[PDB]
């Protein structure tokens, strides 16, 4: 009955910034790792980078991302952030949030409403 909503996409050159956001919506002690995936049009869901929603939680990000993604939280805003830097034509793909849940005791990602789409390419070039 909660989903996540991420947003704050848009279109960005290479080597641009963009910081994507989503509120902790239904954050409680047993759903608190919140996961993010990006799925670029025409392929498939790939897991970007995870925050463990508690004090001294851990930060995990994909080998793609590593080093140029960071993401964060505000407990006072409740709110998640995923501060992407150097980014890459690659990087283009929707974004969303997602709750971790235990079901059939395996770790799912649940809980995903509105992704929010990210482009990132050169503007200034043309060819007709």
């Known amino acids: 009955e909660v989903q996540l909503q991420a947003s704050g996409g848009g279109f960005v050159q290479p080597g641009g910034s963009l910081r994507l956001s989503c509120a902790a919506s239904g954050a409680t002690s047993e759903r608190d790792i919140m996961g993010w995936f ?6 498939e869901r790939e897991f970007v ?7 001294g939680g851990w930060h995990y990000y ?4 590593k080093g140029r993604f960071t993401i964060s939280r505000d407990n006072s805003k409740n709110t998640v952030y995923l501060q992407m830097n150097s980014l ?4 283009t793909a929707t974004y969303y949030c997602a709750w971790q849940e235990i079901m059939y005791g395996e770790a799912y990602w649940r809980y995903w409403g509105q992704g929010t789409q990210v482009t990132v390419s050169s503007e200034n070039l043309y060819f007709q």
């Open 62 to 65: 994909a080998d793609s991302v």
């Open 49 to 55: 980078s995870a925050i463990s929603y508690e004090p």
């Open 38 to 43: 990006r799925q670029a049009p025409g392929k």
């Open 88 to 91: 890459r034509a690659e990087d």
